[PDB]
Amino acid sequence: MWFFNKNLKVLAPCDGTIITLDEVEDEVFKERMLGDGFAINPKSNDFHAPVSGKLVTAFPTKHAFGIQTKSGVEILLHIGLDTVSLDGNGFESFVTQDQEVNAGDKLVTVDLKSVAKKVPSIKSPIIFTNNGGKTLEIVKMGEVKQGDVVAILK
Template sequence: MGLFTKNKSLDVFAPVDGEIIDLSKVEDEVFSEKMLGDGLAFIPENGEFVAPIDGKLVTVFPSGHAYGIVNSNGVEILLHIGLDTVSLNGEGFDIKVKQGQSIKKGDLLVNVDVKSVAAKVPSMHTPLIFTVDSMSGKSFDILKTGKVKKGDLVAQVK
């Protein structure tokens, strides 16, 4: 491990086609008040969600609604698809990965039937959170706002 390995920046890419919104606009206090960490959120245009970073899947909820990914530099990202989607018990979510699996940016995580899911939950807002514990001594910049396509560079952790 080199002297500067821990200081290497981490590029974060859009996990879905859609629009970036400020985390404060997410209609769930856990996310809008940054209880799990800071980040950004997406309003998805479709249901194809891909990995926003390279890393290891430390969490894949059986319901398919949330994914925890840790990068080799220790940064952990939580991608939470929609609000109150855990209540659907996986209905509308076709999971393509397994917990413990190594993934690369752009790898397909899940296909979501957005139309069906959106009709049953309060919102499809999709927070991407940099978890509090993993961000100690680090900061991030949002590099893009508004409309994005999956794979667009949207943030950088330093």
């Protein structure tokens, strides 16, 4: 239900642990330069959409996915760290830019084992590049399953 307010539920795109941005080894992320949110220690390979919206941001390199909900708030899923460097290697995407997706849809499949050696970190950031409703009332931390609620942007 919705009563004088609508919130945004964010799911986990893979299996693993939700950790904080401060636990991310990258100035841009850990410092929240572009926005806030959290991260994930991918246990699984499949990364799924955290919400429903338009893949407004995608790339040939397949390492980062931008989804814009009907509300305009944009959330960015960014697999690991430095992954742009890989020129799309180990990534098998299933989406294209401008595509509309449903939360829990698969975005891509990452060769985590491979990628994990090539880059500084596979810890994957989830940031809201644009909100307004800029409050994460709750971020569920700890061990999660893909498709679990993990945060509320209320």
